[PDB]
Design a protein around this ligand. Structure first.
Ligand SMILES: [Zn+2]
Length: 835
DNA sequence: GTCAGGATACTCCTCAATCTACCGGACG
DNA sequence: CGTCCGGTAGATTGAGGAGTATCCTGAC
């Protein structure tokens, strides 16, 4: 039974049609459990009929002990390699395996399943000892080189001119193997050998960049195109050579470069696309197709489908962006008006590699997954919004009942496992390994699910299964420690690195095994461990850092980057910026500490001088997580923005006194001068006669001005912002303290007294007012605050503790305030200090 | 019958940022 | 019973770079 479509597809090779029509029963007898798709795939090739005949003749012998080839392997060899490859495999069963070559049957299948794989097999047989002995090449590397179309030519060219690149050009064997491990690797290798000095000297290209260009399929064309078009794109189009290298470092990079040259003016002057966006679109595999599709479909997808150009760029910035864009154009109304998906969900689904497949699979499987399995559409969208999401969706549809029934997993656990790149592999690995891990090693299903949730969870699960009996016995590690190490992105690498490096780190550098486990329990923990091993003596000896400080720096997600940045920037920050090593270590000991350190180095002079941000304030701002965005936002709001916005941004730094004396009132001016002098003395900074005269001039010149004394000493002056309290934003509460004379003092919630940290009313506006009255000896005051929830119970009860003996503070909430609970208050209240 | 170049899809590993979730100490 | 408070630890959320894999077309 053959489908008419199958016959139409197979009609490419009429001899295969005759062979299938005549001896199909023999085909299925020699190859049991062979699907029709495999048969039509094998037959339709250039030698389908003869390959099928040879497979029928040989499959009775190729299943022998030397190879034990599966039916699928035989079908793949016959479909890809051809009849010649099958005959060569049959004729050299004894020579390939169990020989000095020492090739496993999988390697033989991988080598032979290529166009002209018989020649590759013959060449690898003839040259394996030569490259393994003289050139010192691993058999894995030789197999990888020979497992490509035209692998014989690449292997011969490597054997001929590996030393020429190793000595006369300084190219390591790994780089040459990477260059020659692609289709037509002989051409790329010869092109590198001919053009490396020219590109490195005349065009100023690093050999790493040239190798990166050539390490792709058809890299000779990319190299020649870079040589020809570097000046044109660098000068006439204003493109950085690194951008050109990034464009040309993909498969078909010559096409991308030519398309960029031809379409940059059009996309930049007729569609409003920035050159950075064009470069981002073209910096992916098949970028010429993506650029042409964007040029054709931007008006259609923007005017009609209501998609912003940024969404179209994000969709088109992936591999196969043409397919994703066409699929979005075709299926946006279908997926929106029928399946209920919002357009942003469709864009999120389509914004990955193979987004067309994900979109089609979502369209096909959303009712099935939502109705038969009870999955929420948000869960299906979350599964699909990943690389290879079609495979994950199909695997979920196949394995949800068995995983939720046999192993007792909940559907939420399965969805969490499958919501990552390669979630199909993780799901299959879980379904295969959970009984083994749980019954033998004692792991609980929750631990297995936690291990398998992250990216590459199949590798982590296999590594855990292989290494737990070794790590937990030889190195004395608790199974919880092993699970914690493995439950991270790239946890296989961290597990192997720990197994290799725990003894040397625990005897030479003296680190505790707990410290090693803490270092290795983060993303990229292998790199952090290697960096610790390399840099611990250097940092501890030259820079005077204790091992605990280095461990604290490295125990983060970017520990390697933070350690390298500390090594680079400790002296320059210490001597040219006046920062103690403790502050540098505190900045570096956070997620993304490299960015924080670089931002501190960049912005310390401007913040400390132009704005007067005491270095301690900058260090405290950067010492928290997200130091780079916080510093950037503070600098941006300081350089330009509403005066009120800068006012709050500089209240939130702490230690600043805002005063808004009213009228001229010379007595009132002297009182304000006394208050600002007292605050400056408390901060240990003397304003001196010039600043005192300037501030009197400012107060006597502009009515309604507000003064702001920074702890550094700078007196910010805002001529006019507001005479009324700003609207409550829900996070920061503002207050104004009014004395008898009339001067107003601005207060902001938070940044409470460090001495009274144990009090539950620290940082509150009423507490701050009471503390100010106590320090400045003010008998009577009224504080108006803007919080609509009213004064909390803490300040209701504990305010009188801070007020001086025989004082009075009147708290006033806004008129429209409503109490948020029973303990709060909602009216003006007078507090008298006690003894 | 091989060899080369291009397009597309899937899987794995680092890095950076933000988001919860508790935890702590004194007064009517 | 009451945080306009911070600190610590853990968990998502997102992006980017790299590796692996297959298939199709064109040319001798
Ligand atoms: Zn309060």
């Amino acid at each position: 039974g053959f489908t008419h479509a199958h016959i139409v597809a197979l009609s490419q090779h009429p001899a295969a049609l005759g062979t299938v029509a005549v001896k199909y029963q023999d085909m299925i007898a020699a190859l049991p459990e062979a699907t029709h798709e495999a048969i039509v795939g094998v037959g339709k090739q250039w030698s389908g009929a003869r390959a099928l005949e040879a497979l029928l003749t040989v499959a009775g012998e190729l299943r022998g002990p030397p190879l034990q080839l599966d039916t699928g392997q035989l079908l793949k060899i016959a479909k890809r390699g051809g009849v010649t490859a099958v005959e060569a495999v049959h004729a050299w069963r004894n020579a390939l395996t169990g020989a000095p070559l020492n090739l496993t049957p999988e390697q033989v299948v991988a080598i032979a399943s290529h166009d002209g794989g018989k020649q590759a097999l013959e060449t690898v047989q003839r040259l394996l000892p030569v490259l393994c002995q003289a050139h010192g090449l691993t058999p894995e590397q030789v197999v990888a080189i020979a497992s490509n179309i035209g692998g014989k030519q690449a292997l011969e060219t490597v054997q001929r001119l590996l030393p020429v690149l190793c000595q006369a050009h300084g190219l390591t064997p790994e780089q040459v193997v990477a260059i020659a491990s692609n289709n037509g690797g002989k051409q790329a290798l010869e092109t590198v050998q001919r053009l490396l000095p020219v590109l490195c000297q005349a065009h100023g290209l690093t050999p790493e960049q040239v190798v990166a260009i050539a390490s792709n399929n058809g890299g000779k064309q990319a190299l020649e195109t870079v040589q020809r078009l570097l000046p044109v794109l660098c000068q006439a189009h204003g493109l950085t050579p690194e951008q050109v290298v990034a464009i040309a470092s993909n498969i078909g990079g010559k096409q991308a470069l030519e398309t960029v040259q031809r379409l940059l003016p059009v996309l930049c002057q007729a569609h409003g696309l920035t050159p950075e966006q064009v470069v981002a679109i073209a910096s992916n595999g098949g970028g010429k197709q993506a650029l042409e599709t964007v040029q054709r479909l931007l008006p259609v997808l923007c005017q009609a489908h209501g998609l912003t150009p940024e969404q179209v760029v994000a969709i088109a910035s992936n591999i196969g962006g043409k397919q994703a864009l066409e699929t979005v154009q075709r299926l946006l109304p279908v997926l929106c008006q029928a399946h209920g998906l919002t357009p942003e969900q469709v864009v999120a689904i389509a914004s990955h590699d193979g987004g067309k497949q994900a979109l089609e699979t979502v369209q096909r499987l959303l009712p099935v997954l939502c109705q038969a399995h009870g999955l929420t559409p948000e869960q299906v969208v979350a599964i699909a919004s990943n690389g290879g999401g079609k495979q994950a969706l199909e695997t979920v549809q196949r394995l949800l009942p068995v995983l939720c029934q046999a192993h007792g997993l909940t559907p939420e656990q399965v969805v969490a496992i499958a919501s990552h790149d390669g979630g199909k592999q993780a799901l299959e690995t879980v379904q295969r390994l959970l009984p083994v891990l749980c019954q033998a090693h004692g792991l609980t299903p929750e631990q297995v699910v936690a291990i398998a949730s992250h990216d590459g969870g199949k590798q982590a699960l296999e590594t855990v299964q292989r290494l737990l009996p070794v790590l937990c016995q030889a190195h004395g590690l608790t199974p919880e420690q092993v699970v914690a190490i493995a439950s991270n992105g790239g946890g296989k690498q961290a597990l192997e690195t720990v197994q290799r490096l725990l003894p040397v780190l625990c005897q030479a550098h003296g680190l505790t095994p707990e410290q090693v486990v803490a270092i290795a329990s983060h993303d990229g923990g292998k790199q952090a461990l290697e960096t610790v091993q390399r840099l611990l003596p250097v940092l501890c000896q030259a820079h005077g850092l204790t091992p605990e400080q280095v461990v604290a720096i490295a125990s983060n997600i970017g520990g390697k980057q933070a350690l390298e940045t500390v090594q680079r920037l400790l002296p320059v920050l210490c001597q040219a910026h006046g920062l103690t090593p403790e502050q540098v270590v505190a900045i570096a000991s956070n997620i993304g500490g490299k960015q924080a350190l670089e931002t501190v180095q960049r912005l310390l002079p401007v913040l400390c001088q132009a704005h007067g941000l005491t270095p301690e304030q900058v260090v405290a701002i950067a010492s928290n997580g997200g130091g780079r965005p916080a510093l950037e936002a503070l600098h941006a709001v300081l350089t330009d923005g509403p005066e009120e916005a800068k006012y709050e941004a500089l209240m939130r730094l702490g230690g600043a006194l805002a005063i808004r004396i009213s009228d001229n009132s010379e007595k009132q001016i002297n009182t304000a001068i006394n208050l600002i002098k007292n605050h400056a003395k408390s901060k240990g900074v003397e304003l001196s006669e010039e600043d005192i005269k300037k501030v009197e001039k400012i107060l006597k010149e502009n009515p309604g001005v507000v003064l702001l004394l920074t702890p550094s000493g700078k007196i910010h002056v805002f001529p006019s912002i507001s005479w009324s309290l700003p609207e409550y934003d829900g996070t920061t509460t503002h207050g104004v303290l009014v004395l008898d004379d009339g001067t107003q003092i601005g207060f902001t919630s938070g940044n409470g007294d460090p001495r009274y940290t144990n009090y539950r009313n620290n940082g509150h506006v009423a507490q701050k007012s009471a503390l100010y009255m106590r320090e400045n000896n003010i008998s009577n005051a009224t504080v108006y605050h803007n919080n609509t929830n009213g004064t909390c119970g803490y300040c209701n009860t504990m305010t009188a503790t801070f007020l001086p003996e025989g004082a009075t503070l009147t708290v006033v909430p806004p008129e429209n305030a409503v109490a948020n609970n029973s303990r709060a208050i909602d009216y003006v209240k007078t507090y008298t200090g006690t003894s």
